[PDB]
């Protein structure tokens, strides 16, 4: 089944970094980019598009 966090909106978190990450947008059925600040946030946060697809898009 699709992991529950795949349904959460992207969360930039906190910190002094500026990292491009990937999240699953369930309404758009797409893995999309967002800016992560380096700490916190939620688990809908992938370093590689392919990992978002394997985990969330095609569970």
XYZ file of C-alpha atoms in Angstrom:
59
model
C 0.000 0.000 0.000
C 1.029 3.627 -0.481
C 2.906 4.906 2.618
C 0.810 7.378 4.575
C 3.366 10.184 4.342
C 3.036 10.200 0.531
C -0.220 12.133 1.183
C 1.445 14.995 3.129
C 2.263 18.362 1.540
C 5.924 19.189 1.068
C 7.533 20.699 4.182
C 10.589 22.955 3.909
C 11.539 22.389 7.560
C 14.197 24.534 9.222
C 17.923 25.149 8.894
C 20.457 27.121 6.883
C 20.639 24.815 3.855
C 18.839 25.149 0.505
C 18.446 21.616 -0.880
C 16.344 20.556 -3.847
C 14.307 17.534 -2.780
C 11.469 15.534 -4.332
C 8.007 14.911 -2.913
C 5.011 12.940 -4.150
C 2.059 15.149 -5.075
C -0.851 12.724 -4.829
C -3.414 15.035 -6.458
C -1.182 15.602 -9.499
C 0.131 11.998 -9.514
C 3.636 13.415 -9.952
C 6.952 13.495 -8.094
C 7.881 17.194 -7.928
C 10.676 19.426 -6.624
C 10.669 21.534 -3.455
C 13.248 23.437 -1.400
C 14.281 21.817 1.879
C 16.040 23.882 4.539
C 17.984 20.892 5.940
C 16.195 19.896 9.160
C 12.768 18.698 10.216
C 9.881 18.452 7.771
C 8.143 15.130 7.046
C 9.015 11.844 5.340
C 7.639 12.917 1.914
C 11.177 14.008 1.123
C 13.403 12.171 -1.372
C 16.887 12.904 -2.679
C 16.201 11.219 -6.045
C 13.118 11.246 -8.268
C 13.464 7.492 -8.859
C 13.138 6.778 -5.131
C 9.958 8.852 -4.893
C 8.529 6.881 -7.821
C 9.367 3.484 -6.319
C 8.108 4.375 -2.835
C 5.066 6.575 -3.493
C 4.033 6.497 -7.137
C 4.245 2.711 -7.760
C 3.984 1.262 -4.228
